[PDB]
Amino acid sequence: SNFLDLQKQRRSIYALGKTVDLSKAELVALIQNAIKQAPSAFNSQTSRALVLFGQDSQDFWNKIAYSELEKVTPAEAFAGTKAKLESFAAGVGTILLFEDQAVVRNLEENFPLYAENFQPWSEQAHGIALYAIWLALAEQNIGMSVQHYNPLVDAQVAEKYDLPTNWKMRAQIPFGSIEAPAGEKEFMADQERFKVFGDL
Amino acid sequence: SNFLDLQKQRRSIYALGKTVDLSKAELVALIQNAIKQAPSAFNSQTSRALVLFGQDSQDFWNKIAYSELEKVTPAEAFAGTKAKLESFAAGVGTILLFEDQAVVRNLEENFPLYAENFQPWSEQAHGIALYAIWLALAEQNIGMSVQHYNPLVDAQVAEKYDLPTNWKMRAQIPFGSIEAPAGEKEFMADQERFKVFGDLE
Ligand SMILES: Cc1cc2nc3c(=O)[nH]c(=O)nc-3n(C[C@H](O)[C@H](O)[C@H](O)COP(=O)(O)O)c2cc1C
Numbered sequence: 001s002n003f004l005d006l007q008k009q010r011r012s013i014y015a016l017g018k019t020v021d022l023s024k025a026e027l028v029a030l031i032q033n034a035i036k037q038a039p040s041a042f043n044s045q046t047s048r049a050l051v052l053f054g055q056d057s058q059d060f061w062n063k064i065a066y067s068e069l070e071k072v073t074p075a076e077a078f079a080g081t082k083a084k085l086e087s088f089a090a091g092v093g094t095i096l097l098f099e100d101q102a103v104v105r106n107l108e109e110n111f112p113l114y115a116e117n118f119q120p121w122s123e124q125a126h127g128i129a130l131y132a133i134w135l136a137l138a139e140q141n142i143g144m145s146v147q148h149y150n151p152l153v154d155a156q157v158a159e160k161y162d163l164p165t166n167w168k169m170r171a172q173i174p175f176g177s178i179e180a181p182a183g184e185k186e187f188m189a190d191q192e193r194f195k196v197f198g199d200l
Numbered sequence: 201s202n203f204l205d206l207q208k209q210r211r212s213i214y215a216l217g218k219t220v221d222l223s224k225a226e227l228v229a230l231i232q233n234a235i236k237q238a239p240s241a242f243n244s245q246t247s248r249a250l251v252l253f254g255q256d257s258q259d260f261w262n263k264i265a266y267s268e269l270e271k272v273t274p275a276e277a278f279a280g281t282k283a284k285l286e287s288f289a290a291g292v293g294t295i296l297l298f299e300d301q302a303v304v305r306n307l308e309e310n311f312p313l314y315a316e317n318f319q320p321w322s323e324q325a326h327g328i329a330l331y332a333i334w335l336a337l338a339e340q341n342i343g344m345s346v347q348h349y350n351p352l353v354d355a356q357v358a359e360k361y362d363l364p365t366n367w368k369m370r371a372q373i374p375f376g377s378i379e380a381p382a383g384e385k386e387f388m389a390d391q392e393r394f395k396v397f398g399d400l401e
């Protein structure tokens with residue numbers, strides 16, 4: 001098999017469970033290594049990550065995200081939110097990805113000739129880290145989805161885990177065993193997406 | 201041979217050659233399929249790409265890039281620029297990655313509540329398409345690098361190929377045969393980069 005097979009295997013999984021065959025040490029090393037190997041502009045390595053397990057992971061969703069969402073969600077709609085938060089907490093853990101703003105700013109100040117690009121290149125590096133993790137877990141038959149309850153949960157997350165303010169949260173990832181396969185995904189016409197020129 | 205092996209094999213190759221044993225059709229498929237499988241915010245699919253071979257690929261660096269860099273690069277320094285441009289054209293081809301702005305705008309306009317997320321999600325989607333290609337090619341022992349001469353060469357590239365005006369260029373990737381391994385790698389202190397809380401049930 002090749003990389004294309006793994007790419008096809010990787011999908012967004014919303015039905016997660018706790019039946020994984022890897023330990024904490026193996027899960028931690030898998031995640032961190034996947035992120036460490038993900039490239040970044042000038043090897044700035046602005047990628048930061050928080051990995052939660054057990055009660056911690058579940059509390060992030062059922063307590064942190066929960067308390068914040070009820071302050072902005074309609075009463076007649078909260079029931080559906082609580083259930084959704086539970087589905088994410090039903091997994092093995094949660095990964096929170098951050099981008100170190102102190103490193104991006106240091107770059108802007110020292111190399112203004114590039115400045116404008118540091119912010120976008122930082123967002124690009126985050127995406128790369130996200131895909132790196134997604135691929136690494138998919139190969140191990142571990143499912144996950146990408147969530148964006150930021151910056152709503154930012155405040156509480158930082159205080160609870162003594163996270164520097166410069167660590168700007170960009171995504172929260174619940175992961176676990178795959179309890180239900182994803183459905184049919186759609187693709188756009190390749191003709192209006194790509195263009196080839198030249199021969200070689 | 202897990203994913204981590206491939207990740208570690210993927211490096212920024214600056215020494216490229218023209219000795220690739222894959223037909224154009226296979227190269228095109230490799231690149232396009234890798235992009236298609238790369239995810240994007242609610243399957244928005246804002247990634248676009250232009251693959252150039254031969255003269256087209258060579259001209260992008262020696263003509264378009266060159267001409268634009270020359271008009272803004274110091275005389276007593278342009279010498280190095282030309283040398284680099286030729287190292288990129290010494291490969292098999294070039295990949296230009298764009299992000300469809302028309303799609304992103306339609307989202308920011310209809311979703312004034314999430315408007316601020318689309319731009320960063322687009323940049324992130326671009327990075328994902330980039331890494332997807334970089335990995336697909338590394339597995340084929342095909343080297344490449346990511347360059348950023350945008351938006352300096354935006355107008356000429358868009359004109360020469362008459363691309364949709366919404367295709368905002370984000371990167372130019374020269375690929376070819378790996379003529380020499382990458383240097384050494386540097387990693388920051390992990391205890392400064394990560395944090396772990398909790399245990400498995
Ligand atoms: C968003 C982003 C922008 C990048 N831009 C450039 C660039 O303009 N020129 C270049 O030579 N390398 C560029 N790179 C490559 C990185 O500098 C390189 O991946 C990093 O130093 C690590 O090296 P490795 O790829 O060999 O592991 C970029 C990487 C990312 C993720």
Ligand SMILES: Cc1cc2nc3c(=O)[nH]c(=O)nc-3n(C[C@H](O)[C@H](O)[C@H](O)COP(=O)(O)O)c2cc1C
Nearest residue numbers: 011012146147148182239240241242243321324325
């Ligand atoms: C930058 C970026 C942001 C995303 N954000 C969300 C999100 O907020 N919520 C969600 O459920 N999925 C989110 N996704 C996942 C995509 O919707 C999903 O990957 C896409 O529809 C393709 O499906 P697949 O992941 O199953 O291949 C995001 C993906 C990217 C690349």
